[model samples]
Every structure is written in structure tokens, then in C-alpha cells.
Target: STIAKDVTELIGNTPLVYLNRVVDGCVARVAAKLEMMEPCSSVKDRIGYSMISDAENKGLITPGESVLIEPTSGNTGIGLAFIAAAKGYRLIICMPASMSLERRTILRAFGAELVLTDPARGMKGAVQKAEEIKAKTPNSYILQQFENPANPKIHYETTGPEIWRGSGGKIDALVSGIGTGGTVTGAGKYLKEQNPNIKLYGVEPVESAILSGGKPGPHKIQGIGAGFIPGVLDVNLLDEVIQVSSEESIETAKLLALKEGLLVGISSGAAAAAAIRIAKRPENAGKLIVAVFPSFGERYLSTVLFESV
Candidate 1:
């Protein structure tokens, strides 16, 4: 019943939908790229596929020989696990214990091993553990999303071109939430190169103001809002950074599910909230603004969505 020739074939060209129903009165038109349509069901699929292939090209990873290792909150872990599973390679995922149980279950379901770090320490804890494990292990490669060039390259080559072509060159702005900062830096650079006037915006949690050049604070939005600036992030490619609160993000997430029938991840809701703010501005009339929806919401059901606050 599978239609694709290979798992790699399921990587790109996701759907784009206009948000006229929710953002109707705004001067700027809103659209969203449904990246969850990827084979592993997230934009991180691009990062995962590219990172592994890039490592192979660089001789850092050999087929059926090297173990692929990395630290992630969830999405990237799922993506890397999928690619590793498909390519017959060993994958070791180091993640925070606070990460949604669904993510851990998914990784195990794909037969990937997990190293859970202290949840109180967050992803930084996982990052530290992964590095230590990689250093001690033999014949292992770390597809470190935090600094991997392939992280951004995937979005540059695929996500950027897809948006430009899908919107027929009418895309005036791209709104993205920063996780590894790959999507914003990569896609933003490509779009701006094509049209110098295109607006590139980043959404960050109000609590964790990493892009704001401020010290980190607590933020609940997973898969986005890193406490520190990622090495792969190209700040020059971004035009503006919008801060969103967890409340605002949660509200938008609920609205998206109730009204738009789009049950997306929290970061997607944050990105959409920022995009809507941009859409309401007087200077953005008749413009197409596409928000990058990174993944789905079901993964967070254990902690945030289904829990009563």
C-alpha cells in the first residue's frame, strides 16, 4: 500500500494552506506550511535526512559501521531515529526526561536506544550527556543539530524553494520559531536571496529570550526556544524577533484545533501568533505570510495539552 519508492521520497513538498478563516480581517494574508506531512511527521525530517547523508558524504559516517548519536528534545530524535532505522544504522538518542512520553515511546517503537537526562536541567543536560557518550564510544557520529550545517542546509534547499514556488513568488514574509535555528536561518537566507525585500521573522518564547540577547528564562514551548544561541543560527538572515507567551501560544493552539482544524505543535502556534501580529500591521497589506508549522500536538498530550492547569 505504500506509494513512495523509498522513505527519502517522503521528505519534502508539504502542503500550504491559507489562514483566511482565522486571520480574515488582517491586511496581510496568512498561510502555513504543514511540515508534519513528512515521513517522520515533522520539519526535523529534513534535518535528520540531510544530517545523516551529509555525515556520510564527509566520511564521518560509514554505512552499516558507524553509530549515529545526538541530543534532542523530541522532534529531532524521532526524525534521526527514523532515518537511522531506515538506513540500517544504530541510533542513540539522548533527551531530557521532561520530554513528552509519546516521543520516548516513538523512539522505542522505532527500535532506537534512549539516554534520558535530568529533566530539571533540560536539553542542556541531554547535550552534555550525548557529548560525553560520543566521546567515550567508538565508531560513533554525532549529528549535533545545534551546530550542524546540514540542519540549516536542508531548509535552505527544500523548505525555501518550496515556499517560493508554492506561493508563486508572492510570499512576502516567513514566520518561524527557532529551535536549532535551522528553519529560520536556512529558509530565511534562501528567500531573501530570491527577493531581497522579503521579511524574515523569528518567534521566541517571552520567558526564554535567547534571540533577544537576554538571559534564559523558563519556557514551556518544546521543540523551540533554546536557552542559548545555536551555532548554526545565522542572525544576519533574520529581520525581526517576536516574543510570545505560553498563554498566547496555548490559546492559539486551541484556536487552531477548534477553528482551523489544525492540531499543530506549540511552536507552530507561537509562530502563527507572531504571523498574525505581522498580518495586522498596516505595512503588510496584500502580502503572503507563511508560518512554518513544525509538527503535530498529539505528542504533548501527556504533559501540557490534556493536563488541567
Candidate 2:
């Protein structure tokens, strides 16, 4: 492999691995795209680069003059911190207090200013706080992953093509949790264009399965359910929605580490769990399913994943 000039050059093109033990008895084959391998260690790296570069190209943000601000659960904040630091811009991240300490520490490591909001209010609260700060601060810009066209556009152009190529155009279904909704809409849309018959399944926290018409409630699965439908999410793009509980997702994450040697995050496990469910369905028998694993397990070492409640 050729050496990348910088970490930004290493943002996309993560490896895809087939699941052996995870879906052993299922008739359908399951594969996972290991997005944690990206330079920032999450799928948000794609949109982070895309959003910042797009703004730069469009002259919306002037380097060294604009302070980038956004609300994040964790992964996106870390991704943006990397970009802002490397590109010589100031970054302010408003995040919920409930996220893993590792995430907050990583953002601080990149010199990002953190504004911790009440965890009870969830992502919506963080977004509100970010907007309030941005409103008060001149020369501040919010990436707003939830509504940014660049979020999905980048996935459509880069992520979708990567998955299509890596799967050899043989993937029958796509599964992932809805965070900013960029992943499902962008990548899922592209896959559907390639083959309309390819099923797309979206995962959400069972507690707040709003997309699936369930009432919003508290959930511990970070980076997936936003308590409301994200603007970037295209409900029409989804063939079905699967609700997985925090307990189930956490358990699946641990199982993935032990059984498949894939130490993915809870959201990844939620996606994988949904994929396994789809694979077991009679209609999906003998098909090939692909799930997006957003990040690794290192961030959760101090959370419930490592400690017994």
C-alpha cells in the first residue's frame, strides 16, 4: 500500500470482513464493513472530511477565522476534532455527559473545547446548546451532520461505491443504525440504485424506536437513536426498521468480541444483530447481507461493556 501523506488521506476505504461464527446457522451470509479502522476510528470520518472540505471549497468557512461547532454523541465529535486540528481551525463540541470518557478525552486531546450538556436531554439538548453557542459567537459554523447534504453526498459518492466494490455487487441487503441518518440514506440509496431489490434495514434503540413509530424513551446505546428522526434520514429509503434494546446490543457487542473476534461498538452490534435477524428470515435465505460497523470497543472499556451493572 502507498503511504498516505496525511491522516485525512486515510479516511475512507475501510476493510470488509465476512462473519463466520456470528451468523453460523443462518442461510444468508453476513459481512461487516470495519469502519473503525479509519484514521479517526469511526464512520463519521467520511462526513467530517466531506463537510469541512465542502465548506472550505464553498468559502463558507475561513480557516483560522471560523470556529467550528457541533453537537455530537461521540464519534462525530472526535472525527471533527481531528479535521479541525489538522486544518488549523478552532472546534467547539457540545456533547451529552453520558458518553464514554474516552470520547471526551480524545476530543480534548485534539484541542477541541467541550461543552457538556445534561445527559437526560440526549442529543437534542446538545444540539440546542450548540445552536445557542453558535448564535452567540460570531464567525462560528455548525457542521450540522443531521441536515447537511454533504453528509449523505459523501457517503453516496465514496462509502457506497466502496461497499459496492468490496461486496462485488453481490450484496442483497444493507443494515446499519441511524445516527445522523447519513450512513443509511447515502450508502443505502446508492446500493438501491445499483439494485432496487437490495433490502435496507435501519436499526434504532428499542426504547426510542421513533422511526419505527415507538415512543421516545431513555436508552444507553450511544450514536444511533437521536430521540427523533434526523433530517438526513430518508424514511422512504428504508425497507424496514429493527429496534434493538441497549441490553441486547451490549450483549451482542460482547458476543462479537468473543465469538467473531470483532470488537465493535454497541451501535455496530445493534447493526450486526439486525443483520443476523434479517439473515435468519426465510425471505433473505441464501442472500448476502452487509452491515456497517461504526467503531471499535476501546472507547467502551470503562462503560457497561466492561463493567457489570
Candidate 3:
């Protein structure tokens, strides 16, 4: 009775943890929504299932006959691979070649086909590649995560409610790194609905600060800062945007591991860094802030993530 009937069933309801050591200088209580605990080990798992289920329900995709194509920064691709395996679909992932090699292997292990886009072109290149492939492949469904409403809808349904319920409706601020922007957009909308005064912060690479009106460019923090503003991002819900360098993000992620014992991915580092900044603000002091940790760092083991350690 305690077992999950299917892998997809184990996707949401990840735990929220307080960072006792990392936020020492901050006056506010900083809590981390450990989304890395999802069955596919990332927040994208929610959208992976949601996007597929919606397409199937809406008759946009046939389970056994369709091939799902998506350009991702590794985690979403992995999430889709997990869901595609559980259901009866094949997944072809288009990823920038710069990401950790472990991620590519993970996709293969899940039986998803892989395509490498030039890193110089960034995620936008990968997206373009996916579109080209979709044009050539029959019955291929481009799970256009960036533009898919289901991306944010699922976050609204599961993640937002969990964060609200976990904090007893007392959560005052949310800081999340935006890739597809689903987590921040949906959860931001949900939190604002509960209390209009709650602040929402979106984080991104300093080089790719589109939300901050900067031109899209390269950055090392993998999952967030997708070189273009995601269609799912609810820009109005965000009170402000924060930018973090890959150096700062990586250092914070290492601190999270060394001090708080949380081995989260780079995007989590960006979110946490921004959350600590928000928590330290005089206005947000003494308030509760939640940061979404999107994935585990195991995928980054082969990268510079833990090299100096």
C-alpha cells in the first residue's frame, strides 16, 4: 500500500528544509523546497508528466505512436525521458553539448535518443534543432516546454500548493531560477493569490538576464537562463529579478553541500544565492523565504561543480 503504483506517481510533494548554516548572516528564515527529490530528480518531472498527460487528454498525442522531442538543458530532457519510459513513448532530447556528460548518459540509460546542439548557439540552438527534427519526423510531438501552458499549470497544481501548505500560508517571499519559468510563474501566481504582498524573485545568469532586460548570452549555470524569455514565465507575477554569476552560483552550491549538506544542481545554487540576498534585505528580514532547488548535483560531478573540493 505504501508503494508508488508507477514512477510518474512519485513525481511531486518534495520536502522543504531550513538552511541553518548557509543563511547565518540573514535575518529571515530561508527554507529550501528540495525539488531534487522528485522521482526523476528534478522539478521538471512535474512538467514532464503534466505536458504529456495534457497532450494525451487533449488528443494532441497518441501514446504508443508518438515520439516526443524537446530541447532542454539536461534536467527537463531527463524528466521527459522518465515519463516517456513509464508511458509508451520515445523521447529525443536536443541538448547543448556543453552540459555535463553524465546527463547525456542518463538520457541513454533511460532509452531516450540524444542530439547535440552546438554550445556556441546555446539552448536556442537546441530548440531550433528540435524544431528541425520535428519537421522531419512523423508523429513527433515537440513538447515545447518553453511555450507549453502545462509547464506552469502543473506547478500551480502541485508545487505552489505544497509550498503554501508547507509554510502554513505564512511564506512571504519566493526565489526561483527561471529556465522554462514554470516554477516561478505558477507558484508566484499561486502565492500572490494567497497573499498579494508576497514578493516573487526570478534568478538568472548575469550574462543572460532577459527578465532584467539584458541581452541573452552565455552562462554556466545550466538549467536557468535559457537565452530567451520562456513563454510560460509570468513576468508580471515577479516583483524583481536577480542575476548571479556562474562563479557565485557554483560557490553557493558548494556551500550548500559543505555547510547544509545539500547536493543540489547549479540552478538551485542561483536560487539559493538570490534567496539569501532577499532574506538579508531589511524589508524581508524576519519573513519566511522559500527557494526552489531544481535538481541534484550528481549530474554535474564531471563538470567543475566539485573540482576544487
Candidate 4:
């Protein structure tokens, strides 16, 4: 029997599940990229794995001895912790103090040193804190996913190809939540290269619709949108920027659980929300739309995920 060595071996190749009930009367077929199927149950795991692998190949970090540090809100930190623990590395995750308790707990469970920054400062504060810590910590390998080319490159290599191959090169559009912007940028770029006509829409919280020319603000949704746009994110790749409210995201997420039987995070709902809207559009009739669902809802148990559902 051919056996895989570790969890990282199973990071990509996620299945695309088509939405039947959600599509309803829509003529377009909506397919979801179930990223939660990754080993750490988040699409961020691929970036973590890809980042580490790239760094190692570039002679950046000594796995057993280097101290890795990053600023993240949730899934990325969890995935890094999972990777570091398995590969014999120490990790320090700087995050906003006000994130869902589930995110903090998950990081700690993976043996990561969870450093909380001021909640009021948002993710920008977390990034600053990580920078401060790295200056003092010896052998600190900063996996700056934002500026690191590897961030989007990973999605281009995996997420993009996966959707293309899985859909049998038939996808016509992509609705992705803007986290680091890597997901949408890299994957969207690849899809476009395959067929320049593919529509790619980027979604973020309604309150934090900076990409849509709105000011930076707080929102209830996690894992997407922050105080600043990521450097690695090729914003020009997107065809449109869509903003979904936390209220709409929450309600849509509940519908996903009750209707689609997919209990993913709020960002997933936002992506699906935007995806469905694209599907319902008269211009997109009969087109294939792919939605990227970032993570699972189980991690959101400490929040209001199941309250109204």
C-alpha cells in the first residue's frame, strides 16, 4: 500500500460540491470549493504548508531550530500551528484580542504561543505586535503572508489548478472572500489565464468594504478583510468588489447549515452570498460559478454561529 507521510501531504485537492437547493431558480450552476476538507479544516493550511515548503527550499528557516512568527486572525494561525508542531518548529501567533474565543483556543491547542494585541487596534495592531516580537526573538522566521509572493502563488498552484481540473476546465466565474487577497488574486489570476473571460468577484464585510472604497471598520465576520490591503494580493485581478453585511452573512451562513448542509464559517456564507448573486444575474445565466468556502463552522461554536439557527 502507498502511504502518505504526514498531514501536509493531504492539504489540497479539495472537492467541488455543487449547490442545488441554494441555486434554486438560478440558471447558473454554483459549485463550492470545500476548503475545510484540508487537514486543518481551513484553506489557510495550504498557504502554511506552501510557505514553509518554499522557505525551506530557499534556505530561510531551520525547521527544528527556527522560531516562526506571524500575525493572523484565525485560520492561518491555526494552520501554521498545525504545520509547525508537526515539522518541529516553534510558532508565535499574534492576533487581535477580540477575535472569537474558538480561534484563540484552537491556536493554543496546537502548541502555538498566542500573543494577543489590543482588540481596538484590529489586525494592523496584531501585525505590529508580530514585528515587535520578531525583532527581539532570536532566529525568528517571519512568514509574512501579505507581502510574500508565495502566499498567492500557493493558491495559483493549488486552489486555482484544483478548481480548473475538478471543474474539468469548465468554470466561468469565482466568488472569493478577500482575506489576504491571495485566495482571490492568485486563484482568480490563474482561472483568468486559462480563459480570460472568467468573472472573478471579491467579497468582504459590508462595514469593512475598503476594497469597495469604504473606510476600514470592524465587522462580525472573521478570516477576511482587515485594516489594510495585503501587498501580495493582486487587486487588479478582480472583476468586481462585493460587500456583504455581517447580518446578511450570518443569515446566509445559517441557511447554508439548514439548506445546503454545509456548516462553514461566516466568510463562507459571504462568499456563497456573493456567488449566488452572481449566479442569479441575467448575464451569468448557465455559467459555472465557484465559491471558496474558507473554513468550518465548528470552530465558530464559541460565537453566535448557531444562536438563531
- Residue-level lDDT for 301 in candidate 3: 63
Clash number for candidate 4: 0
> Who is ahead in TM-score, 2 or 4?
4
Off by over 4 Å in 4: 305-309
Clash pairs of candidate 1? Answer: none
- lDDT for every model? 0.87, 0.88, 0.88, 0.87
How many angstroms is residue 270 displaced in model 3 relative to the true structure, after the best TM-score fit?
1.3
Compose the digit string of candidate 1's lDDT tens values, residues 79-124: 8888888888889999877566667888998888999999888777
Candidate RMSDs in Å, in order, are 1.9, 1.9, 2.1, 2.0
Where does candidate 1 stray beyond 4 Å?
A: 1-3, 302-309
- Give the Cα-based TM-score of candidate 3 against the true structure: 0.94
Model 4 TM-score on a 0 to 1 scale: 0.95
Question: If both were scored by TM-score, which would come out higher, candidate 3 or candidate 4?
Answer: 4
Give residue 154's error in model 3 in angstroms.
0.3
Q: Compose the digit string of candidate 2's lDDT tens values, residues 82-176.
A: 98888899999998886666677788999999999998887778989999999999989999888899999999998889999999999999998
> Where's the lowest-lDDT run of ten residues in candidate 2?
300-309
